[PDB]
Ligand binder design. Sequence first.
Ligand SMILES: O=C1CC[C@H](N2C(=O)c3ccccc3C2=O)C(=O)N1
Ligand SMILES: [Zn+2]
Length: 109
Amino acid sequence: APGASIFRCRQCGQTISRRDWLLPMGGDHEHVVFNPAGMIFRVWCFSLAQGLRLIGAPSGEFSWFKGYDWTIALCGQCGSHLGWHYEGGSQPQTFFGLIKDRLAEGPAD
Ligand SMILES: O=C1CC[C@H](N2C(=O)c3ccccc3C2=O)C(=O)N1
Ligand SMILES: [Zn+2]
């Protein structure tokens, strides 16, 4: 009965990812970053995620991960901004960077 298994959207409970899918990018699954608006994010990298809606076309502007282009990832259920999907890079080609404090962690479904 693990209690730290699944990540859900904090606002609505949509299933988003899993602890098993944490991805250590450059040696750490956690990356502390800031955007041009000065917002600090504690980003957890995941190999896979679900329940999101990726919005727009990819952009390389201000990417926190060298070689990757990003798209905003919203909760597909409630529209909460949960992070970004990264693509266009290498090893892996793609991954998700999700904002840790916008997820709730809990037992499996
Ligand atoms: O890797 C990334 C993801 C996108 C993120 N980003 C933002 O969070 C943001 C907010 C407002 C204007 C422009 C941006 C932007 O590039 C960012 O700065 N780097
Ligand atoms: Zn949600």
